[PDB]
Amino acid sequence: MGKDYYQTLGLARGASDEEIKRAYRRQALRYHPDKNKEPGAEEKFKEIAEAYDVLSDPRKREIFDRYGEEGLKGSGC
């Protein structure tokens, strides 16, 4: 509830692509089911992956910058 994307990957709207992708590359490697198949890293990676879409696609971020969560029909509930 109050589902963060930017902050779940550790950013705010105002982070540039070169901040965003900086974090995203690290954040994938933190839990990747291809690096750290750690028990419960995968669900972390899966929740990151919802944020990861925003935190890479500038057209997804265009809606998240203009609005935020209230703009973005990721997951609903």
Q: Say how far apart CA 21 and CA 56 lie, in whole Å.
A: 6
Both tokens of 49, joined, read 């992956």
Cα distance from N-terminal residue to C-terminal residue, the chain: 9
Residue ranges making up the domain that contains 61: 1-77
The DSSP symbol for 70 reads G
**What is the dihedral angle through the alpha carbons of 11, 64, 15, 45, rounded to the nearest 10 degrees?**
40
Both tokens of 39, joined, read 């028990």
Q: Say how far apart CA 72 and CA 23 lie, in whole Å.
A: 21
- Contact 13/6 with Cβ under 8 angstroms? yes
Tell me how the structure was determined: NMR
- Contact 15/7 with Cβ under 8 angstroms? no
- Contact 8/64 with Cβ under 8 angstroms? no
How many folded domains does the chain comprise?
1
Say which amino acid occupies 63. I
- Contact 9/23 with Cβ under 8 angstroms? yes
CATH of residue 19: 1.10.287.110
Q: Say how far apart CA 58 and CA 36 lie, in whole Å.
A: 28
- Contact 45/33 with Cβ under 8 angstroms? yes
CB atoms within 10 A of CB 70: 7
